[model samples]
Target: ALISRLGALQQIIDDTPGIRLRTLSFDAARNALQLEISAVSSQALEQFSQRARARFRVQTGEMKDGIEGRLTLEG
Candidate 1:
């Protein structure tokens, strides 16, 4: 099931016909989840912002420990 979901998402991104992109990650040691999803498509990118809620929804249980830190290029 997990694999299928991931595959579907990957397919969406792959078939979406765009290059702009972003990353997402979570810190179980701190108990927090994040999604920096982005895209080159101005349309899709804007949509991504609104989809933040949906994106985070699936990651609510990511961090089992305390969950902390952030996922960014700075780190």
Candidate 2:
């Protein structure tokens, strides 16, 4: 049910390579979905981050550390 609402974003993840979704939940306060993701390669990590930003409207600018981070999406 939850994933049905996240179909578009899910498509992006399912189509991408070298990345695994660890968590996907909603944040009541932020009114968004907190999606925690991990990458097998930094290239895919950064690549997906960019798409999620411009296309998916994700919040991850503070995620400038490594191959793992959380993204906030309007849920």
Candidate number achieving the greatest lDDT relative to the actual structure: 2
Q: Mind giving the per-residue lDDT tens digits that candidate 2 earns over 18-70?
A: 77788778866767788888887667877778767866665454443446767
**Per-residue lDDT tens digits of candidate 1, residues 1-75?**
344444544554465443223555546555443434444445544443334324434321121112221222111
- The TM-scores, one per candidate, come to 0.38, 0.72
TM-score between candidate 1 and the true structure? 0.38
Estimate the overall C-alpha local distance difference test score of candidate 1. 0.38
Question: Considering summed lDDT, which 10 consecutive residues are worst modelled in model 2?
Answer: 57-66
Candidate 1, residue 14: how far the Cα is off, in Å: 0.4
